[PDB]
Coordinates of C-alpha atoms in Angstrom, one line a residue:
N13 CA 24.1 -76.4 269.6
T14 CA 25.4 -80.1 269.9
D15 CA 23.8 -83.4 269.0
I16 CA 25.4 -86.8 270.0
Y17 CA 23.6 -88.9 267.3
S18 CA 25.9 -87.5 264.5
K19 CA 29.1 -88.6 266.4
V20 CA 27.4 -92.1 267.2
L21 CA 26.3 -92.5 263.6
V22 CA 29.7 -91.4 262.3
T23 CA 31.5 -93.6 264.9
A24 CA 29.6 -96.6 263.6
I25 CA 30.5 -95.9 259.9
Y26 CA 34.1 -95.0 261.1
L27 CA 34.3 -98.5 262.8
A28 CA 32.8 -100.2 259.8
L29 CA 35.4 -98.6 257.5
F30 CA 38.3 -99.2 260.0
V31 CA 37.7 -103.0 260.7
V32 CA 37.0 -104.0 257.0
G33 CA 39.5 -101.4 255.4
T34 CA 42.4 -102.2 257.7
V35 CA 41.9 -106.0 257.3
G36 CA 41.2 -105.8 253.5
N37 CA 44.4 -103.7 252.8
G38 CA 46.5 -105.7 255.4
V39 CA 45.6 -108.9 253.5
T40 CA 46.2 -107.1 250.0
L41 CA 49.8 -106.3 251.2
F42 CA 50.3 -109.9 252.8
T43 CA 48.9 -111.6 249.6
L44 CA 51.2 -109.5 247.1
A45 CA 54.2 -110.0 249.6
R46 CA 54.0 -113.8 248.9
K47 CA 52.6 -113.8 245.3
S52 CA 56.0 -112.1 234.7
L53 CA 56.3 -108.4 233.5
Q54 CA 52.8 -107.7 234.9
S55 CA 54.3 -107.8 238.5
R56 CA 54.6 -104.0 237.8
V57 CA 50.8 -103.9 238.6
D58 CA 51.4 -105.6 242.0
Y59 CA 53.9 -102.9 243.0
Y60 CA 51.4 -100.1 242.4
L61 CA 48.5 -101.8 244.2
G62 CA 51.0 -102.6 247.1
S63 CA 51.7 -98.7 247.4
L64 CA 47.9 -97.8 247.5
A65 CA 47.2 -100.8 249.9
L66 CA 49.9 -99.4 252.3
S67 CA 49.1 -95.7 251.9
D68 CA 45.3 -96.4 252.4
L69 CA 46.1 -98.8 255.4
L70 CA 48.1 -96.0 257.2
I71 CA 45.1 -93.6 256.7
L72 CA 42.8 -96.2 258.5
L73 CA 45.4 -97.5 261.0
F74 CA 46.7 -94.1 262.4
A75 CA 44.6 -91.2 261.0
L76 CA 41.1 -92.7 261.7
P77 CA 41.5 -93.6 265.4
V78 CA 43.2 -90.2 266.2
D79 CA 40.4 -88.5 264.2
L80 CA 37.6 -90.5 265.9
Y81 CA 38.9 -89.8 269.5
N82 CA 40.4 -86.3 269.6
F83 CA 38.4 -84.6 266.7
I84 CA 34.9 -86.3 266.6
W85 CA 34.4 -87.0 270.4
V86 CA 36.9 -85.7 273.0
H87 CA 37.9 -82.1 272.1
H88 CA 39.5 -80.0 275.0
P89 CA 41.9 -82.7 276.3
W90 CA 44.4 -83.9 273.5
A91 CA 46.0 -87.3 274.5
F92 CA 48.6 -87.8 271.7
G93 CA 50.9 -84.9 272.8
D94 CA 53.0 -82.5 270.7
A95 CA 54.6 -85.4 268.6
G96 CA 51.2 -87.0 267.9
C97 CA 49.7 -83.6 267.0
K98 CA 52.6 -82.8 264.6
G99 CA 52.8 -86.4 263.3
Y100 CA 49.0 -86.9 262.7
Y101 CA 48.9 -84.0 260.1
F102 CA 52.3 -85.1 258.6
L103 CA 51.2 -88.8 258.2
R104 CA 47.8 -87.6 256.9
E105 CA 49.4 -85.3 254.1
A106 CA 52.0 -88.0 253.3
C107 CA 49.2 -90.5 252.4
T108 CA 46.9 -87.8 250.7
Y109 CA 49.9 -87.3 248.3
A110 CA 51.1 -91.0 248.0
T111 CA 47.6 -92.1 247.0
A112 CA 46.9 -89.2 244.6
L113 CA 50.3 -89.7 242.9
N114 CA 49.7 -93.6 242.7
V115 CA 46.3 -93.0 240.9
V116 CA 48.2 -90.9 238.3
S117 CA 51.1 -93.4 237.9
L118 CA 48.4 -96.0 237.0
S119 CA 46.8 -93.8 234.3
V120 CA 50.3 -92.9 232.9
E121 CA 51.2 -96.6 232.6
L122 CA 47.8 -97.5 231.0
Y123 CA 48.3 -94.5 228.5
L124 CA 51.9 -95.7 227.7
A125 CA 50.5 -99.2 227.1
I126 CA 47.7 -97.9 224.7
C127 CA 49.5 -94.7 223.1
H128 CA 53.0 -96.3 222.7
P129 CA 52.6 -100.2 222.7
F130 CA 56.0 -100.8 221.0
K131 CA 57.7 -98.2 223.3
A132 CA 56.0 -99.6 226.5
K133 CA 57.3 -103.2 225.7
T134 CA 60.9 -101.8 225.8
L135 CA 60.6 -98.7 228.2
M136 CA 58.5 -100.3 231.1
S137 CA 60.5 -102.7 233.4
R138 CA 60.1 -104.0 237.0
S139 CA 63.5 -102.4 238.2
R140 CA 62.2 -99.1 236.6
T141 CA 58.8 -99.3 238.3
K142 CA 60.5 -100.0 241.7
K143 CA 62.3 -96.6 241.4
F144 CA 59.0 -94.8 240.5
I145 CA 57.3 -96.1 243.8
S146 CA 60.5 -95.1 245.9
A147 CA 60.3 -91.6 244.3
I148 CA 56.5 -91.2 245.0
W149 CA 56.9 -92.1 248.8
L150 CA 60.1 -90.0 249.2
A151 CA 58.5 -87.0 247.3
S152 CA 55.3 -87.3 249.4
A153 CA 57.4 -87.5 252.7
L154 CA 59.5 -84.4 251.6
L155 CA 56.2 -82.5 250.6
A156 CA 54.5 -83.4 254.0
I157 CA 57.4 -81.9 256.1
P158 CA 55.7 -78.4 256.4
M159 CA 52.9 -80.0 258.6
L160 CA 55.6 -80.8 261.3
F161 CA 56.2 -77.0 261.5
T162 CA 52.7 -75.5 260.6
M163 CA 50.8 -77.7 263.2
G164 CA 51.5 -77.8 267.0
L165 CA 49.7 -77.9 270.4
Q166 CA 48.4 -74.6 272.0
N167 CA 46.8 -74.2 275.5
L168 CA 43.3 -72.6 275.2
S169 CA 42.0 -73.6 278.8
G176 CA 44.6 -78.9 280.7
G177 CA 42.6 -77.9 277.6
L178 CA 45.5 -78.3 275.0
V179 CA 44.3 -78.5 271.4
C180 CA 46.1 -79.4 268.1
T181 CA 45.8 -76.1 266.1
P182 CA 48.1 -74.4 263.5
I183 CA 51.1 -72.5 265.0
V184 CA 51.8 -70.3 261.9
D185 CA 49.8 -67.3 260.6
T186 CA 46.7 -67.5 258.2
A187 CA 48.7 -66.2 255.1
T188 CA 51.5 -68.7 255.8
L189 CA 48.8 -71.5 256.5
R190 CA 46.9 -70.4 253.3
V191 CA 50.0 -71.0 251.1
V192 CA 50.9 -74.6 252.4
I193 CA 47.1 -75.7 252.0
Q194 CA 46.8 -74.0 248.6
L195 CA 50.1 -75.9 247.7
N196 CA 48.8 -79.3 249.0
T197 CA 45.4 -79.0 247.2
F198 CA 47.0 -78.3 243.7
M199 CA 50.0 -80.6 244.2
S200 CA 48.1 -83.6 245.7
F201 CA 44.7 -83.3 243.9
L202 CA 44.1 -80.8 241.0
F203 CA 47.4 -81.4 239.1
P204 CA 47.0 -85.2 239.6
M205 CA 43.2 -85.3 238.7
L206 CA 43.7 -83.1 235.5
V207 CA 46.5 -85.4 234.3
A208 CA 44.8 -88.7 235.4
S209 CA 41.4 -87.6 233.8
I210 CA 42.9 -86.3 230.4
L211 CA 45.4 -89.3 230.0
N212 CA 42.4 -91.7 230.6
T213 CA 40.2 -89.6 228.2
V214 CA 43.1 -89.6 225.5
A215 CA 43.7 -93.4 226.2
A216 CA 39.9 -94.3 225.8
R217 CA 39.8 -92.2 222.5
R218 CA 43.2 -93.7 221.2
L219 CA 42.0 -97.3 222.2
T220 CA 38.6 -96.9 220.5
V221 CA 40.5 -96.4 217.2
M222 CA 42.3 -99.8 217.6
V223 CA 39.0 -101.5 218.7
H224 CA 37.0 -100.0 215.6
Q225 CA 40.0 -100.8 213.3
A226 CA 39.6 -104.6 214.0
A227 CA 36.6 -104.9 211.6
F228 CA 36.0 -107.7 209.1
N229 CA 39.8 -108.7 208.9
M230 CA 39.5 -110.6 212.3
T231 CA 36.3 -112.2 213.7
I232 CA 37.8 -112.2 217.3
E233 CA 39.6 -109.0 218.6
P234 CA 42.9 -109.6 220.4
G235 CA 43.2 -110.3 224.1
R236 CA 45.4 -107.2 224.7
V237 CA 42.6 -104.9 223.2
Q238 CA 39.9 -106.6 225.4
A239 CA 42.4 -106.3 228.4
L240 CA 43.2 -102.6 227.7
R241 CA 39.4 -102.0 227.1
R242 CA 38.7 -103.6 230.6
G243 CA 41.7 -101.5 232.0
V244 CA 40.2 -98.2 230.8
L245 CA 36.7 -99.0 232.4
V246 CA 38.5 -99.7 235.8
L247 CA 40.8 -96.7 235.8
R248 CA 37.7 -94.5 234.8
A249 CA 36.1 -95.8 238.0
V250 CA 39.4 -95.1 239.9
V251 CA 39.4 -91.4 238.7
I252 CA 35.6 -90.8 239.4
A253 CA 36.0 -92.7 242.8
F254 CA 39.1 -90.7 243.9
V255 CA 37.5 -87.3 242.8
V256 CA 34.2 -87.9 244.6
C257 CA 35.9 -89.1 247.9
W258 CA 38.7 -86.4 248.0
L259 CA 36.9 -83.3 246.5
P260 CA 34.8 -82.6 249.7
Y261 CA 37.9 -82.9 252.0
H262 CA 40.1 -80.5 249.9
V263 CA 37.2 -78.0 249.7
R264 CA 36.7 -78.1 253.5
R265 CA 40.4 -77.5 254.1
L266 CA 40.4 -74.5 251.5
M267 CA 37.1 -73.1 252.8
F268 CA 38.6 -73.2 256.4
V269 CA 41.5 -70.8 255.6
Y270 CA 39.7 -68.6 253.0
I271 CA 36.4 -68.2 255.2
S272 CA 38.5 -67.7 258.3
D273 CA 37.8 -63.9 258.6
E274 CA 36.0 -64.2 262.0
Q275 CA 32.8 -63.4 259.9
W276 CA 31.5 -67.0 260.3
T277 CA 28.4 -67.1 262.6
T278 CA 26.9 -70.0 264.8
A279 CA 25.9 -71.7 261.5
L280 CA 29.2 -71.8 259.4
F281 CA 30.7 -73.5 262.6
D282 CA 27.6 -75.9 262.7
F283 CA 27.8 -76.6 258.9
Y284 CA 31.7 -77.2 259.3
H285 CA 31.0 -79.6 262.2
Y286 CA 28.8 -81.9 259.9
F287 CA 30.8 -81.2 256.7
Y288 CA 34.0 -82.3 258.6
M289 CA 32.4 -85.7 259.5
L290 CA 31.0 -86.2 255.9
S291 CA 34.3 -85.1 254.2
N292 CA 36.6 -87.3 256.4
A293 CA 34.2 -90.2 256.2
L294 CA 34.6 -90.2 252.3
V295 CA 38.5 -90.1 252.7
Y296 CA 38.3 -93.3 254.7
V297 CA 35.8 -94.7 252.2
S298 CA 38.5 -94.2 249.5
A299 CA 41.0 -96.2 251.6
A300 CA 38.3 -98.8 252.5
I301 CA 37.3 -99.3 248.8
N302 CA 41.0 -99.8 247.6
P303 CA 40.9 -103.7 247.9
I304 CA 37.9 -103.7 245.4
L305 CA 40.4 -102.0 242.8
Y306 CA 42.9 -104.8 243.7
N307 CA 40.2 -107.5 243.1
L308 CA 39.3 -105.8 239.7
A309 CA 42.9 -105.5 238.5
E310 CA 44.0 -109.1 239.5
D311 CA 40.7 -110.5 238.0
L312 CA 41.7 -108.7 234.8
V313 CA 45.5 -109.7 234.7
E314 CA 44.5 -113.3 235.7
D315 CA 41.9 -113.5 232.8
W316 CA 44.7 -112.0 230.4
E317 CA 47.4 -114.6 231.7
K318 CA 44.9 -117.5 231.3
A319 CA 44.1 -116.5 227.6
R320 CA 47.9 -115.7 226.9
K321 CA 48.8 -119.2 228.4
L322 CA 45.9 -120.9 226.3
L323 CA 47.4 -119.7 223.0
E324 CA 50.9 -121.0 224.0
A325 CA 49.4 -124.2 225.5
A326 CA 47.1 -124.9 222.4
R327 CA 50.1 -124.3 220.1
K328 CA 52.4 -126.4 222.4
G329 CA 50.1 -129.4 222.1
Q330 CA 49.7 -130.0 226.0
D331 CA 46.0 -131.2 226.1
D332 CA 46.1 -131.5 230.0
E333 CA 47.0 -127.7 230.4
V334 CA 44.2 -126.6 227.9
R335 CA 41.4 -128.5 229.8
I336 CA 42.8 -127.0 233.1
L337 CA 42.8 -123.4 231.8
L338 CA 39.3 -123.7 230.1
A339 CA 38.0 -125.3 233.3
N340 CA 39.1 -122.2 235.5
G341 CA 37.3 -119.8 233.0
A342 CA 39.9 -119.0 230.2
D343 CA 38.5 -117.4 226.9
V344 CA 38.3 -120.1 224.2
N345 CA 37.5 -117.4 221.5
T346 CA 40.7 -115.4 222.5
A347 CA 43.1 -114.2 219.7
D348 CA 46.8 -113.0 219.3
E349 CA 47.9 -109.8 217.4
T350 CA 47.4 -111.8 214.1
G351 CA 43.8 -112.6 215.1
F352 CA 44.7 -116.3 215.4
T353 CA 42.2 -118.1 217.8
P354 CA 43.4 -121.1 219.8
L355 CA 41.6 -123.4 217.2
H356 CA 43.8 -121.9 214.4
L357 CA 47.0 -122.9 216.3
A358 CA 45.7 -126.4 217.3
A359 CA 44.5 -127.1 213.7
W360 CA 47.8 -125.6 212.2
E361 CA 50.2 -127.5 214.6
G362 CA 47.8 -130.6 214.3
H363 CA 46.6 -131.6 217.8
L364 CA 43.1 -133.2 217.2
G365 CA 42.9 -134.0 221.0
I366 CA 42.9 -130.2 221.9
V367 CA 40.8 -129.3 218.7
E368 CA 38.0 -131.7 219.9
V369 CA 38.0 -130.0 223.4
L370 CA 38.0 -126.3 222.1
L371 CA 34.9 -127.1 219.9
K372 CA 33.2 -128.9 222.9
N373 CA 33.7 -125.7 225.2
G374 CA 32.4 -123.5 222.3
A375 CA 35.2 -122.3 219.9
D376 CA 34.1 -120.2 216.9
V377 CA 34.7 -122.9 214.1
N378 CA 33.9 -120.1 211.6
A379 CA 36.7 -117.6 212.7
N380 CA 38.4 -115.5 210.1
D381 CA 42.0 -114.3 211.1
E382 CA 43.8 -111.2 209.6
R383 CA 44.4 -113.0 206.2
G384 CA 40.7 -114.5 206.5
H385 CA 42.0 -118.1 207.0
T386 CA 39.4 -120.1 209.0
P387 CA 40.6 -123.2 211.0
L388 CA 39.6 -125.4 208.0
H389 CA 42.0 -123.5 205.7
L390 CA 44.9 -124.3 208.2
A391 CA 43.8 -128.0 208.5
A392 CA 43.8 -128.4 204.7
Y393 CA 47.0 -126.3 203.9
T394 CA 49.0 -128.7 206.3
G395 CA 47.0 -131.9 205.8
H396 CA 45.0 -133.3 208.9
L397 CA 42.3 -135.6 207.3
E398 CA 41.1 -136.3 210.9
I399 CA 40.8 -132.6 212.0
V400 CA 39.1 -131.5 208.7
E401 CA 36.3 -134.2 209.2
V402 CA 35.8 -133.0 212.8
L403 CA 35.6 -129.2 212.0
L404 CA 32.8 -130.0 209.4
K405 CA 30.9 -132.1 212.0
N406 CA 30.8 -129.0 214.2
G407 CA 29.7 -126.9 211.1
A408 CA 32.8 -125.2 209.6
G409 CA 31.9 -123.3 206.4
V410 CA 33.1 -125.5 203.5
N411 CA 33.2 -122.7 200.8
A412 CA 34.9 -120.0 203.2
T413 CA 37.3 -117.8 201.1
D414 CA 40.3 -115.7 202.4
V415 CA 41.6 -112.2 201.1
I416 CA 43.0 -113.8 197.9
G417 CA 39.7 -115.9 197.5
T418 CA 41.3 -119.5 198.0
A419 CA 38.7 -121.8 199.5
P420 CA 39.9 -124.8 201.5
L421 CA 39.5 -127.1 198.4
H422 CA 42.1 -124.9 196.7
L423 CA 44.6 -125.6 199.5
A424 CA 43.9 -129.4 199.8
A425 CA 44.4 -129.5 195.9
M426 CA 47.4 -127.1 196.2
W427 CA 49.2 -129.9 198.4
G428 CA 47.3 -132.9 196.7
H429 CA 45.4 -134.3 199.8
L430 CA 43.4 -136.8 197.6
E431 CA 41.7 -138.2 200.9
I432 CA 40.8 -134.6 202.0
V433 CA 39.5 -133.5 198.6
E434 CA 37.0 -136.4 198.6
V435 CA 35.6 -135.4 202.1
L436 CA 34.9 -131.7 201.2
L437 CA 33.0 -132.9 197.9
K438 CA 30.8 -135.1 200.2
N439 CA 29.9 -132.1 202.5
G440 CA 29.3 -129.9 199.4
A441 CA 32.6 -128.0 198.4
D442 CA 32.2 -125.7 195.4
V443 CA 34.3 -127.5 192.7
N444 CA 33.8 -124.5 190.3
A445 CA 35.3 -121.7 192.5
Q446 CA 37.8 -119.1 191.1
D447 CA 40.1 -116.9 193.2
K448 CA 41.7 -113.4 192.4
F449 CA 44.2 -115.1 190.0
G450 CA 41.2 -117.1 188.4
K451 CA 42.7 -120.5 189.1
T452 CA 40.0 -123.1 190.2
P453 CA 40.8 -126.1 192.5
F454 CA 41.2 -128.3 189.4
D455 CA 43.5 -125.7 187.7
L456 CA 45.8 -125.9 190.9
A457 CA 45.5 -129.7 190.8
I458 CA 46.7 -129.7 187.1
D459 CA 49.5 -127.1 187.9
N460 CA 50.5 -129.2 191.0
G461 CA 50.3 -132.6 189.0
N462 CA 47.8 -134.3 191.3
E463 CA 46.4 -136.3 188.3
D464 CA 44.2 -138.4 190.7
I465 CA 42.9 -135.2 192.5
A466 CA 42.4 -133.4 189.1
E467 CA 40.6 -136.5 187.7
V468 CA 38.1 -136.4 190.7
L469 CA 37.4 -132.6 190.5
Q470 CA 36.7 -133.1 186.7
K471 CA 34.1 -135.9 187.4
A472 CA 32.4 -133.8 190.1
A473 CA 32.0 -130.7 187.9
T474 CA 30.7 -133.0 185.0
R475 CA 28.1 -134.4 187.4
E476 CA 26.8 -130.8 188.2
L477 CA 26.5 -130.4 184.3
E478 CA 24.1 -133.4 183.9
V479 CA 22.0 -132.1 186.9
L480 CA 21.3 -128.9 184.8
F481 CA 20.0 -131.1 181.9

């Protein structure tokens, strides 16, 4: 019982996967080969790109010819027969072990942030990749001995040389070592990481309006590596099952139906193995899209603090996050208003910066503008619609801080917009009380007159 359509249909998909997957992975290697501490990401995607390319470049064509179509006459000889299964198992390992390495490094980043900043290094990562490939090569050696050509008819076929019990051990080993062991670790680590991360995400409540970039980056990383785990399982599960079923269901019991089932199941199972390889460049696009967006934001905070207006406009233009925040909860607007760079401050608000943004301490951009003393920046923030009576953890409004450093000019501009002259903090001191304590006699004189006006309004 034979049908050609299955082979033709499979061949079409095999070609579709080959052409795109080979080119995609080829470019992925070429791109990274040309072009921070997040170059460790590049090394891992380079390994997958290579391991996935070899599958499509060497395993697929040999599969498509001598396994799908032409059966009896084997055209790759004893070396090609031995080598095929070696290069296959080397890449089944290398890929499986790279997917774990990813989840181990994401876990380390979330679980041990302080440790990961010291422990993780480029030179260290390089060693890890070296080990993975060398481990995979060493673990694939058995396939050079277990597989070899035999003459059935010249009708020479690439069939195992060793016995079923011997063959059952190496395959049982391969499956656990290069799938189950990895997938358990990868899954649980990613599950623990997601749980661990969700604590940090939820912990950032009230204290900071905008959650840090790292949290948003790691939260993005979890989603991706979740897809990587689910992707790898679905692609590789059927293939491993087929291999295991082969040896365990090899009792000569199998009728003209188990053979038929295996014929199709082989095509389906292998097709998904190449799909795994063919998908890889998507994971590269997702990872780079994430790290790029993180580096933009990271740069924006530096640039906005630096006072380089040109760089800020450039970053924002590309698609950097204006409402990003550092570990403290400091948005770019905080840094600009603090350092005093009106030029930048005007841009950030134009693009859509949260003018009412509370950091860890609860200090809005207007607090930082008053504390220092930028009469220009204060006037701007209010035009956009900064809260005039916003209070921090202690309870000090901007008018407290303007008074606390005697900005007579600034004190006047708040009053115009409608600053609460009668506002007491944790220590009970009003803006006037601080003005008196400071010795800003002019400032104190104003606050007094403003409060008095409110009295007459009552009567």
